[PDB]
Each structure stands twice: as structure tokens, then as C-alpha cells.
Ligand binder design. Structure first.
Ligand SMILES: Nc1ncnc2c1ncn2[C@@H]1O[C@H](COP(=O)(O)OC(=O)[C@@H](N)Cc2c[nH]c3ccccc23)[C@@H](O)[C@H]1O
Ligand SMILES: COc1ccc(N)cc1
Lengths: 333, 325
């Protein structure tokens, strides 16, 4: 059997080009090479307060977006996290093998606590343990994610190793698959801050479902630097905005930064931004064209969810059975 | 019938205080209330434990509750981990529980997240079954209050999804104090086991512990009820009264001109009389694996039917896409 790939994305906000480059791009390319399982993590989404209609709609939007990107339900298992109870079950169990200090030290918890001070909830704190349960359920070998998830992934490995050391070979110890370029796409008006699907300032973000024209305007307005003459060179410290543009272009086209630097020799930021806008306006038009075909077909979306949850539960129940046996629960018969 | 929820720890080493106090009280109210008994194995693992002993303890607890008179045809008794809805609701309620509320629970960075987060699981345990009443001790009053606050908070956002649970106020009335410390209650959590009489102790063990029990230096020795001045003797009277149903004034008359030796002898004989009938039932149930499996299956099946209905409403309110069956 093939090694197993697992990853997920929250149905909250509107997925950005950041989410595509750091994760979904890789998800599509891994489908034949590995046994791939992709999840819409609605249980993680509710750690941030959403309107009920928006949550339901965003779950289906996200599903249709996976499909529009090229995630093929004939190759990959595609499911909604809440449809498989084993995530919640293993998540509770793994709380007992996770230290408080490991969760309080998390960057994401700290960033999210500052952003949502009126709702610093227990789910936001316990976030990484459920995420570990998501991965560990499927005997996952590889986890394609953006750089912002490295810390969460490190904890999952620690939990797997710690549990295995007491009980035997129950889990696989997963490995991150973070891409060389586009692992952490930055904000267009604030290139020192990660591009967030929940920025109020829309201008920071390139939406996967935002109007391309509005997106082309966003690239042209992206902040660069005061260098005289302007030079297209990679330097995240002194040229954050230009570097982010080079990183985006590299990730979309598959060309290296040193290659792109040679390509823009004697050129300035107008050329860079023309070429970035071109490459991105292109992906989105195509992507949004596949999207509606999927998104307006409720019977097909219902079928993908049904089939995917079936496949997922078969794997997850198998692992949870072994976990429950090992910790000492009386088996349900 | 109001719905009553109790969580039973699979590790508790139950005493005659537990039995003649709350347990016997509740055995005689299984037709008055819709009683739920949940053996809380997911709570147990917040303390690291030997796996095989936890499995054994789950079944020991089930058999002991059955032996004490919990009737699986009247009440619902089941193992927590057999009903996935507990963990499911637990996670959802984490998202409507403040971090501060958990930090302020009467608790540095080396405690496991389960020990930190279990009050939310407790809330889920109760709220799943539309629980009206929860019989708690003083030590779990804070947890009940949190579950009431979570229920009201969720209902204010989404409509009346949960019942707001109430404490069960009336106490059993059977008083049972520690043998070497008559001022303190006999507790299943006592490190000093000479203070307690476990429900599975044999007649020789009970004799030894009752013989050792503290009594005053009154001269002449007198068997009279007086908690302030004769705590130990009064405890022995209360235990004997609880066992036989004879009133304190009846026992005071029964022991007129008798020393503390004769009282201790009668207390030991009385308690062991009670424990022998209970132990016969326990071992009969406990050694019948097929009967225990059937009780767990039926109970989980009953619990799940109810729990799934609540969780479906919870899931609909939050806005999750409904599962495709
Ligand atoms: N500006 C950016 N540049 C590049 N990559 C980015 C950018 N912003 C986000 N990402 C990546 O996109 C994925 C989805 O984002 P989420 O916020 O839903 O990502 C999250 O919140 C996860 N915890 C969801 C999750 C839950 N359980 C899991 C198990 C395995 C893997 C992932 C998960 C992520 O991989 C994230 O790293
Ligand atoms: C009681 O809170 C929890 C927390 C996490 C999970 N997965 C289940 C229940």
C-alpha cells in the first residue's frame, strides 16, 4: 500500500492565494504518488465564532474549491471533519498525552488570542490536539502544509512518539511537506505579516474567489521599497514586498528565484508586477470557471461527502480501536 | 420523569459511606426519575494508569453498581467511551467555554491537557441527555456551575437546545465518618485506608478496622450519641443505625450498661452482614462476562439514541453540514 498523505483546511474566511501555494497546490500534485486524504476541518473552524449560515456555506465553498483545484474524488478521499466522530474521540484521548505547557507555548494560540480577545475559548487553546488527532487517525506519513503549521506538526510528532513509546506501534510519526517557495505568502500592503484569509483589509489578500480584475489592481498597489534604482532582487529583510512578489511568481510558474532574478535584470517593479498579475489573474479565472460547475451541483457535492466520509471512517475506526485497546478501555461490541 | 445524570469513576474504591449514603438513596428512586449512570473511562485517563487495570476497574465498577441494586431495565448504565457523542459534544462546547473559566477552576505547565479540559467533557456528559438534575458533592459544585453557564450561553445564541441542569439538593441522611478521624467524613478518596470500610472487605478485615476505631475516654464508658464530645462512639451508632434501620434512641437503650467492645462487635457483625449479601451479588455479576457485555451494549444503545438527538440539534444550530448516511 502507498504511504498516506493527510491535510486539511478550515471553512472560515475565504481561502487565499496563500492557502493555495502553501497547501492546496501540493495536495493536487501528490494524488497519484501517495494515498491522499483531504479534510474540510469544520470543527477547527468553530474555534473562531462564525454565523451558522456562513459556516455551512463556507464548508461547501471549500469542498467545491478542492474540486476546482483538481482534487479528484476518484483518487483522493475528501470529507468533512465533523462527519467522522473519531476525530473528536481521538482528540479527547490525546489531550491526556499532551502537556499544558506545549499548548500555551503555541504561536498560533497567542496570535489568535490577540485578534479575538473577546473569545479566547478552550477550543482555540486545545486546537493543536484535535489537529494531531486528525493526522494520527489515518496512519499519516506526509502532511502538506504551509510554514505557519510547522509548530502544530512538531507537536503531532511528539504526541505520536510519546504515545508509541508507552503502547507500541499504534501511530505513524508524520513528516511535514512544506514547499520550497510559497510556503508563507505575505500580505500585499504589509509584507512583514503573513497573508491571512481573515484580514478585514481585503487589499492585503488575493482571494481564490475574488474577482481577478480586483486582484490585478491589488498586485499593482502592493508595497515594494525605496531602492534607487529599483532592482528585482530577493532580500526579505530590506525588500520584503519585492521578495514576496518573486516568491509568488516562483511558486506559480515553478521557476527558481535566482532564475527570476536573471530574468528581471535591468527591469524594474512594473515588469515584476505585470508578470505576477499575469500568472495569478490566469490561475484564478480558470479556477473560478471549474468552481461554479462543482459548487452549484449539490447532488455531486453530497455524493463526494458521503463517499469520502465512508472511506475515512474505515481508516479512522481501525486506528481508534487500537488506541482504545492500548489505553485500556473496554471495547464496544 | 426528570432526567438524572451521574458519572461513576472506574477506579473509585467504594465505601459503606458511598453505599448507605448516596447509592442506597438512588437505588430506591429508579422509578421516580429517569436515571443515567455513566462509567467515566474518558475522565479516568486524565490520570496516567495501567491499561489492564483500567479495563478491569471499568467492569468491577459496573458489577458493583449492579450489585448495589442499579437495575439496567429501569435505569441506563453504560461506559462513557462507548458513546462517541460525549467526545463530539465535548469538542463543540470547548468552543463556547472561556479559557479563563478553566484556568479559574480550583487547580504548573506539566499537567496534561485532559486534566485542564475535563470540566468541559463533564458539561457535555450532562448536557447530552437533557439532564434536569445532577447529584454532586461539594468538590464538583464548580463543575456543575460551569455546565449551567455553558448551557445558558449556548442557548442564548442558538435557542433552547439544552436543559439547564440543577443540583439534586436533598442529602441521603446516612452519616458515616472516618474511623480514626471521627470529625471527617468517610471518603472513597482517603489515602489512609484504616479510616474507611470498602464494600469488598471480608468479615476479618471489618472486625480489625472497627476494633481500631477511635472512641472517647469517658468513665464509665457510655454508649450515648454526642457528636461534639463523643465523636467516635456516635459514628459507631450512626453506622449501626444506617445498617439496621434502628433509631439512635433505640440503640442507646439497647447498649445501656454496655462497654465500647460490645458496640464494636455489633457494628462489625452488622456491616459484614450487609456486605456479604452485596458481595454475593457482585461476584455473581462480575464473573458473568456475557451478562456484563449485554448490559453495556443495551445501555450504550439507549444512551446513543438520546445523545445523538441532542448532538444533531447542537450540530444544526452551529451550522455544520449534516452527515450523509
Ligand atoms: N499566507 C500563507 N502562505 C502559505 N500558506 C498558507 C498561508 N496561510 C495559510 N497557509 C496554509 O494553508 C493551509 C490552510 O490554512 P488554514 O488556516 O485553513 O490552516 C489551518 O488552520 C490548519 N490548522 C488546518 C488543519 C486542521 N487539521 C489539520 C491536519 C493536518 C493539516 C492541516 C490541518 C495550511 O496548511 C496553512 O499552513
Ligand atoms: C471535552 O472537550 C473535548 C476536547 C477535545 C475533544 N476532541 C473532545 C472533547
Amino acid at each position: 500500500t502507498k504511504p498516506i498523505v493527510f491535510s486539511g483546511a478550515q471553512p472560515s474566511g475565504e481561502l487565499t492565494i496563500g492557502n493555495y501555494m502553501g497547501a492546496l497546490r501540493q495536495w493536487v500534485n501528490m494524488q497519484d504518488d501517495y494515498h491522499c486524504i483531504y479534510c474540510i476541518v469544520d470543527q477547527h473552524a468553530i474555534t473562531v465564532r462564525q454565523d451558522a449560515q456562513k459556516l455551512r456555506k463556507a464548508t461547501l465553498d471549500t469542498l467545491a474549491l478542492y474540486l476546482a483545484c483538481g482534487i479528484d474524488p476518484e483518487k483522493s478521499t475528501i470529507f468533512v471533519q465533523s462527519h467522522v466522530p473519531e476525530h473528536a474521540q481521538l482528540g479527547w484521548a490525546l489531550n491526556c498525552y499532551t502537556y499544558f505547557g506545549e499548548l500555551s507555548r503555541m504561536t498560533q494560540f497567542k496570535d489568535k488570542s490577540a485578534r479575538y480577545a473577546e473569545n479566547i475559548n478552550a477550543g482555540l487553546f486545545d486546537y493543536p490536539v484535535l489537529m494531531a488527532a486528525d493526522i494520527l487517525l489515518y496512519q499519516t506519513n506526509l502532511v502538506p502544509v504551509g510554514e505557519d503549521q510547522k509548530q502544530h506538526l512538531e507537536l503531532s510528532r511528539d504526541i505520536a512518539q510519546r504515545f508509541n513509546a508507552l503502547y507500541g506501534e499504534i501511530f505513524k510519526v508524520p513528516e511535514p511537506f512544506i514547499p520550497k517557495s510559497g510556503a508563507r505568502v505575505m500580505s500585499l500592503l504589509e509584507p512583514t505579516k503573513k497573508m491571512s484569509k481573515s484580514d478585514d483589509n481585503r487589499n492585503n489578500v488575493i482571494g481564490l474567489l475574488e474577482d481577478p480584475k480586483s486582484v490585478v489592481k491589488k498586485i499593482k498597489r502592493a508595497v515594494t521599497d525605496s531602492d534607487e534604482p529599483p532592482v528585482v532582487r530577493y532580500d526579505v529583510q530590506n525588500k520584503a514586498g519585492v521578495s514576496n512578489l518573486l516568491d509568488i511568481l516562483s511558486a506559480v510558474t515553478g521557476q527558481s528565484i535566482p532564475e527570476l532574478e536573471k530574468q528581471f535584470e535591468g527591469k524594474m517593479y512594473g515588469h515584476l508586477k505585470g508578470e505576477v498579475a499575469d500568472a495569478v489573474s490566469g490561475m484564478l479565472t480558470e479556477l473560478q470557471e471549474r468552481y461554479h460547475r462543482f459548487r452549484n451541483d449539490e447532488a455531486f457535492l453530497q455524493q463526494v461527502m458521503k463517499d469520502g466520509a465512508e472511506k475515512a471512517s474505515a481508516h479512522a475506526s481501525r486506528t481508534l480501536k487500537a488506541v482504545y485497546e492500548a489505553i485500556g478501555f473496554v471495547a464496544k461490541r
